[PDB]
Amino acid sequence: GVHTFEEESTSPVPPAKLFKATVVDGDELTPKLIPAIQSIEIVEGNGGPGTVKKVTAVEDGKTSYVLHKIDAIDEATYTYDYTISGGTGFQEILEKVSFKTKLEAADGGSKIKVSVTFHTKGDAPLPDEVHQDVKQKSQGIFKAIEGYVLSN
């Protein structure tokens, strides 16, 4: 099953700066800013398309690993597409979640365009709680980084 949503939002942060913090420096900043996220390490690749990363998260004694694949990256157009999977036992209905992200200049800051694709096991629909939990975590991580840029 394939379930698609789009979100548009703004930032006061200009796109180059927002792209560098979110995507180029995301592996450095995310474990530093999000208590629950222990580490982000390269499993395979050179940081270009096809690169797989392991994100280690701990909450309430419970340690979980989601894998993160780069599908596309282009710094000139602030394009970053990636796929999240793994975390066995964590939210069982998802095979994988594909993000397409793009930033552009608006009024001295950024316009942020996100497209997300939830891939379910075998034609299941997308539960509300799972969509909300994935949206909250990805918005939360991007905003935490966005706030960090504004705080320096």
Binding site for Na ion (CB under 5 A): 31, 37
Shortest distance, position 31 Cβ to Na ion, whole Å? 4
Shortest distance, position 32 Cβ to Na ion, whole Å? 7
d(C-alpha 23, C-alpha 146), whole Å: 11
Of all residues in this chain, which one has the CB nearest to Na ion in the complex?
31
Other beta carbons within 10 Å of 138: 17
Q: Is 39 within 8 Å of 56 (Cβ atoms)?
A: yes
Nearer to Na ion, 114 or 149 (CB): 149
Nearer to Na ion, 28 or 44 (CB): 28
Q: What angle do CA 103, 95, 120 make, to 5 degrees?
A: 90
Nearer to Na ion, 26 or 31 (CB): 31
Copy the structure tokens of residue 24.
């180029």
Shortest distance, position 19 Cβ to Na ion, whole Å? 22
Nearer to Na ion, 36 or 124 (CB): 36
Shortest distance, position 52 Cβ to Na ion, whole Å? 20
14 exposure class (CB count in 10 Å sphere: 0-12, 13-18, 19+): middle
